[PDB]
């Protein structure tokens, strides 16, 4: 999929930037971030979820239904929160606060 094309709102460096972190913890190297990848990425940033609050977070994102996070689940992360989108210090807002991708532009 084209990154570039769909999420024009992110400059070529952002989505660089989200492409580094989200390989960071794709420890599988499969191209997705599951639930229990996602469980150690919160736990690292300092902000532990529960099981079903961590299965909440992937469900807002995962519009193509892999029942975890493709690359383009993980930019939608970060198009919702430069758009005001995600609740107020849900999992998600937290995800994307603790990242220190700054989209608040
Ligand atoms: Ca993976």
Do not use: W
């Not at 807002?60 to 383009?72: N, Q, T, W, Y």
């Not at 005001?84 to 999992?91: A, F, N, P, R, V």
Request: hydrophobic fraction near 40%; include cysteine.
């Amino acid at each position: 999929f084209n990154p570039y094309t769909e999420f024009k709102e992110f400059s070529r460096k952002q989505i660089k930037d989200m492409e580094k972190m989200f390989k960071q913890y794709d420890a599988g190297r499969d191209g997705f971030i599951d639930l229990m990848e996602l469980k150690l990425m919160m736990e690292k940033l300092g902000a532990p979820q529960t099981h079903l609050g961590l299965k909440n977070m992937i469900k807002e994102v995962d519009e193509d239904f892999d029942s975890k996070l493709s690359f383009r689940a993980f930019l939608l992360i970060f198009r919702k929160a430069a758009a005001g989108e995600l609740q107020e210090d849900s999992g998600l807002c937290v995800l994307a606060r603790l990242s220190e991708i700054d989209v608040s532009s």
